Design a protein around this ligand. Structure first.
Ligand SMILES: [Cl-]
Ligand SMILES: [Cl-]
Ligand SMILES: [Cl-]
Length: 124
């Protein structure tokens, strides 16, 4: 089984680019991160910052998570992110995504020792 920290890395980190380069970024990344294997993941956000900067968010601003848990943290600074969401023409096994690049604060849930991101809650 994949660890919670590794799953967060695979689903949400893309430190290789400063930002989405084209409208096809999400189609390519949702496929390469294996998020379209058996079904199309409907919504998924990628963070374009170093893994170290994302991990550092776990010691930044403690805020409530949407589900009410109290282990969420909001990055003090904005970060480059890309939201990937299925369009209307999307249908497994022919997934199709809209790519929306933005600079926002990220909110992640953290856990473990080391205390690292295990869930992407939202961006602001
Ligand atoms: Cl793994
Ligand atoms: Cl791990
Ligand atoms: Cl997400």
């Amino acid at each position: 089984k994949e660890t919670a920290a590794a799953k967060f890395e695979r689903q949400h980190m893309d430190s290789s680019t400063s930002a989405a380069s084209s409208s096809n970024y999400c189609n390519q990344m949702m496929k390469s991160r294996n998020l379209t294997k058996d079904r199309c993941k409907p919504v998924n956000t990628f963070v374009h910052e170093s893994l170290a900067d994302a991990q550092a968010v776990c010691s930044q601003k403690n805020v409530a998570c949407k589900n009410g848990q109290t282990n969420c943290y909001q990055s003090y600074s904005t970060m480059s992110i890309t939201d990937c969401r299925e369009t209307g023409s999307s249908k497994y096994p022919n997934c199709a995504y809209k790519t929306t690049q933005a600079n926002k604060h990220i909110i992640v849930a953290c856990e473990g020792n080391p205390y690292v991101p295990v869930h992407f809650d939202a961006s602001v």
